[PDB]
Amino acid sequence: GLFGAIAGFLENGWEGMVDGWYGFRHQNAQGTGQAADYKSTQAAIDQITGKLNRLVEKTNTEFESIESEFSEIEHQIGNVINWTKDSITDIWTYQAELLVAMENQHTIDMADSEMLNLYERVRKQLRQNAEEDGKGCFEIYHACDDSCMESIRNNTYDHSQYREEALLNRLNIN
Amino acid sequence: GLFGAIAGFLENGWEGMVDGWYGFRHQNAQGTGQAADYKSTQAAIDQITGKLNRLVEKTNTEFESIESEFSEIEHQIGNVINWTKDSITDIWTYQAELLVAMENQHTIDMADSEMLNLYERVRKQLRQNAEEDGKGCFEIYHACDDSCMESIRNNTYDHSQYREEALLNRLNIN
Amino acid sequence: GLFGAIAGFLENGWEGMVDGWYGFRHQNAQGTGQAADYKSTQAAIDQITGKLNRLVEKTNTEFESIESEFSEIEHQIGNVINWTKDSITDIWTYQAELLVAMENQHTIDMADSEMLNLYERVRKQLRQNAEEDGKGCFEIYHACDDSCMESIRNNTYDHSQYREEALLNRLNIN
Amino acid sequence: DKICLGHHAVANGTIVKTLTNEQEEVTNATETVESTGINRLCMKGRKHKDLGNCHPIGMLIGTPACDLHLTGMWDTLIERENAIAYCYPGATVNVEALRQKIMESGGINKISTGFTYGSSINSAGTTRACMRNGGNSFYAELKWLVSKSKGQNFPQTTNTYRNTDTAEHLIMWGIHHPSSTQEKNDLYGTQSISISVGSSTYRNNFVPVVGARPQVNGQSGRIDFHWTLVQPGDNITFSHNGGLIAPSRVSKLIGRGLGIQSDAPIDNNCESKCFWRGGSINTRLPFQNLSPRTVGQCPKYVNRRSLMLATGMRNVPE
Amino acid sequence: DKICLGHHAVANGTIVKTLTNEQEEVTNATETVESTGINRLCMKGRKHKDLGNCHPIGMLIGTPACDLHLTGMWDTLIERENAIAYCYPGATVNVEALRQKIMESGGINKISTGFTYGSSINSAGTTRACMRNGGNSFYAELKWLVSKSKGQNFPQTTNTYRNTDTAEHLIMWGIHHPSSTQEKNDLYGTQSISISVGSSTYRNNFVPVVGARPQVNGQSGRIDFHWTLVQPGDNITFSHNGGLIAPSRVSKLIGRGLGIQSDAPIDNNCESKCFWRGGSINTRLPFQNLSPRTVGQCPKYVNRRSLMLATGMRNVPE
Amino acid sequence: DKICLGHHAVANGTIVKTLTNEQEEVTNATETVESTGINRLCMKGRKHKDLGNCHPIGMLIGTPACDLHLTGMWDTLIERENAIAYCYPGATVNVEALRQKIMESGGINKISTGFTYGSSINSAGTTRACMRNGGNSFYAELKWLVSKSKGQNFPQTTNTYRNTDTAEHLIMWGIHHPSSTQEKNDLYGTQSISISVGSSTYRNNFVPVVGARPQVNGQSGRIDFHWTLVQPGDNITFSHNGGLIAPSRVSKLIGRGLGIQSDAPIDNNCESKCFWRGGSINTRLPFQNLSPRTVGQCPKYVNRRSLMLATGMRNVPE
């Protein structure tokens, strides 16, 4: 969308990840796996919570009655009241519609943003050891066992360890 | 702006491109050319259309008159009505002023965003076979004829097909 | 953040830079240094000025009184004026509350954007002569003196000048 | 070999406002505030009554100018300027509340009171202020009760209207205020005059009062009109002895309709849902700058000539 | 060898509105407009008064239906439909201002006027319209003054009430309007009849008027009820010669309360701060489409069944 | 060799609200709600009129306290608390409409009625509650008409004001309501008393009524004031036999101005466009939290101490 990941260069979402909002799938010698990223997921959930908290804050403002339900209201003042009440209702509906339309547009973009921030975060961590496939995957140009994969997910992967092997495998020279 | 492409690292737009919103210019052995990208253009247009729909949707709220054009209004009730209408007016010109301002902002930036997303899409296609100009261009390190240029725009460029030739030209070896 | 940099992959802000909003810290054989970027600082500053200009514009709506301070109001018309005035205040406090929260959310994110845009501008100047830290730093793979650092911050750095050298340093072969 | 990325640009951009910039140039923008109104009353698809010179009040009392508007069904009532409501000079208590009840109705039905009067009453009081077909006449829905024998005391009389319908009825009446002691005595006798009106919930007394005043339509006498609603199943009794301008027909407002105050020509060609003093407003735009006073389903009024909404990207030429 | 980035999806997505898409599917949403109300009056935590068939105006004058509500203290007042204001038929001048004034009070005290009457006057007059213990009675806070000498002229009397308290006092009185010349003469005599009322701020005059009227509760006579606020330290004087329905007790409204008009059942177990015709409303949601007419601390009323807020990201299933 | 990108920070940050966070810290922010008012009426640059202890109604009828305020021109009108309109006790019908009419005027002209009276009328009625220049006086724009001979019947008289001007005029008159029969008799006699007022538009009758009541400024009598507009070219007739407080002059409201109610002192050295009971408000801010009751060109009132608008990025210290 605004940031190009969700509904963008990422083909689709993972129904099988009930673990969090964003995450990893890896393929290696040992096989496959799936693990959700906690920091990026909570970054998005906390912002949704921030919206839900603003929504629910109650500014009242006790109102009393200006329209009798059980007796006749003089016609001129009743028409002023009606007209006033409808103009105000028109205003509140318009805002309620604007709020929800604006908030949602921003929610789906910020969520796209957290996805992209994590993708960028991983990309920089592998620097010259992998390449982007264009679909949100990094092709790693060195052997990477589960302890290497878990280090990528845990943000501790040391690019200096595999650079030599990777550049070799990438450039196909030297 | 927000995404750095439009009025950003792209020095200016193309008045020549009456073909679409976003597009490609190239330059190879057979000469130059131009072609609009349809998908990125339609993605932007549809978001505009979407705004013009919410704008144009109407409320079903019917208002009767509380002011006689042709006869006097009692002076006290008249003042209240004047006070109430002007107050409602002020609220509405604020909302209208705000809506247009906010929406124009979002519109400008989403167009920038879709440009950036086309750019990023092409970058990842070419992966290690090209480099960035800094001005939205990609220098291509292999013979890329008209069919090849087309395959890039038509999102079917296969980078492995030219990788060897490109990596050598980039390393400046044989 | 939306754009990943400020309060994102940049660890923290620099209290020691008061000459501008965004800037460069470098380190060569001559030692360290610091300079603020004017372009990105003014791009962001001018946008805060834009919002401030909009906050200050004034309606020409004269209001008279409909509520006497020093005499009694007829009880029923009084309750209608109260209800009305309170209803209008509720709209305005809601609208002021929302104006602030929405403008602030945008101000933060465009500042984050201007930082990223500058960062992205540098990444492209250096192209193949440098690599990324992940912390907003660029490791340069050639000897960059204080004349060369200055060429970077001034957008006059020619990457072809140092390409041969840096490439060798990155491939780690001589 | 190199492939370049770009966006389009136009010769003449358009200026719009954003949160951060007051004069941002984009490729295209559309207006959101309507500036153009139709100077005609677009009445296509609607059953409308143009009242011409008949004022809505006159529909209820039977002023000659309103003879063809005493009954009907409509979904939109059109009232004009300088519409006539009184032939014989007078005024109506709470006239504006009454004009509003009528102007938001969808029609008027008339029903006879069935009021009969004894032999000593001339129930055909007439005046040259209300001309009808070249004759002296009176308010069609009213009768001016006067002593049949001049100068004699108007007899104590009681008339009761029974509402036997299932809907509330709008009963009007008038109280004659003579311009001289001579005229009063001539019409009603020298007795002290009182008119008392009582329903189940409404009750009110009246007294005709002599007063010198200027001539309006040639008459210095005055009629104060009064009204109430009579609930279905309720009776309303008029007790009196001179000066009662009695109702012979009672009104019943039917359903709902849109009231319009404008002297702009009717046009049965175009449709509309929004009207104002100067005609009609047809837009899909949410806002208009034509008038703060409108009726119908209307675009909200704003104090701005223009509020352009960008439909295109930032315009960057070179 | 490769690692892949992704986000979650669900099978069942929800539709929400964005600025650009009327039908965008996200993973989860929440409602923002409350459509569910309670069919009861949640009165927990509040000292309430359910007036039942007693109408608030009946509290001040003492209609037998309001016998349990002549005094008291509340922070919320519940008025029901078809509540009784009058036993002997009549109307109250400026009734809505008076009713609202009572419905926003937090209690009522009654103080005696201390009015006394000469022997020629019967102050314990009574009517079949007002029943207590199955017998003829009258308004508890009022006294129907009639000549003890049937047919003889009511004396020229004067009654002054003095507010010795530090707060203003609601005073009400009645003016009788008989149904026959005979009825008047019997109760008050053949003399001209005037009632005058004067304080430092309010002054007025009333004339009893005979008129034929339909029977309400078996009576064709009417009583016009009138009221003012006697300010502290102020005296108000009644001068009259028959026709005054005099106050034996005066009202004083205490503090502030919430006035509810509803025919909903009372629930003393649930708590609430928002009420309307149909009951109570409890939500943290800023919007509700239950009713445009609400009292207390309520969510703003909107013309929408649902406005869903996205609480998740775009749903891209596969 | 490395170059690093960065942004600035401050030791002392400020807190703002955002859509997703109530406590986001940023480098700098600025206030949007104005808390600071001015406890003065900043009247620089405007023709103002400070009425002092003169109540606006008093300007029309001519209370002594309003003697420097019977005419004049202005663009803002200042009304103080406890200002005096009535020297002789009484009230004006539709007083608030009349008060507002004056408070949105830009000046008052007085024009003479020319009312002359026969020999049996003392048109120089005078009272010790309207002191002026050391002696008993009366309203300067009115005349207390009384029978020259004490106890004699007040002659039947008729007076007509002819508006020969090009704009409407405000006319006021009073009805005297004595406190005793003796009092009434001395002034006007024993005859029935009646006052009739009639124009082309307006007709009403008044009956002076005797009643016992407390004293205000030593007077148990009252004078009720009445008013209407007299359209250009129209006439208006007074038919009376005692009790009419006659108009010697009528009023004409010139143009428009700003009516201020405030007991805040006048500062002629500061300029403002927004006022309230407490003084003035001068801001570039769109909102204030001083008063919900303001007049002029004002910021909208909100229920907030503070709303901080961010003028810098997130503050990220270390």
Ligand SMILES: *[C@@H]1O[C@H](CO)[C@@H](O)[C@H](O)[C@H]1NC(C)=O
């Ligand atoms: C006010 O609106 C209600 C709801 O439609 C309607 O029943 C009532 O008649 C209106 N009042 C007047 C005076 O039109």
Ligand SMILES: *[C@@H]1O[C@H](CO)[C@@H](O)[C@H](O)[C@H]1NC(C)=O
């Ligand atoms: C209401 O406003 C109109 C014009 O905006 C004005 O002519 C009219 O006098 C105002 N009503 C009152 C009672 O001042």
Ligand SMILES: *[C@@H]1O[C@H](CO)[C@@H](O)[C@H](O)[C@H]1NC(C)=O
């Ligand atoms: C209107 O509100 C003001 C301020 O709270 C209050 O003093 C006044 O009594 C209210 N008016 C009525 C008629 O309740």
Ligand SMILES: *[C@@H]1O[C@H](CO)[C@@H](O)[C@H](O)[C@H]1NC(C)=O
């Ligand atoms: C109306 O009059 C009829 C007969 O005249 C009578 O039967 C009926 O009870 C009356 N209705 C009322 C409410 O008095």
Ligand SMILES: *[C@@H]1O[C@H](CO)[C@@H](O)[C@H](O)[C@H]1NC(C)=O
């Ligand atoms: C009320 O009457 C008492 C004595 O009856 C008197 O002292 C007091 O001054 C009076 N107050 C007024 C306002 O007339």
Ligand SMILES: *[C@@H]1O[C@H](CO)[C@@H](O)[C@H](O)[C@H]1NC(C)=O
């Ligand atoms: C007012 O009186 C003058 C002179 O008596 C007369 O010419 C004029 O026509 C009168 N105006 C009206 C409206 O009667």
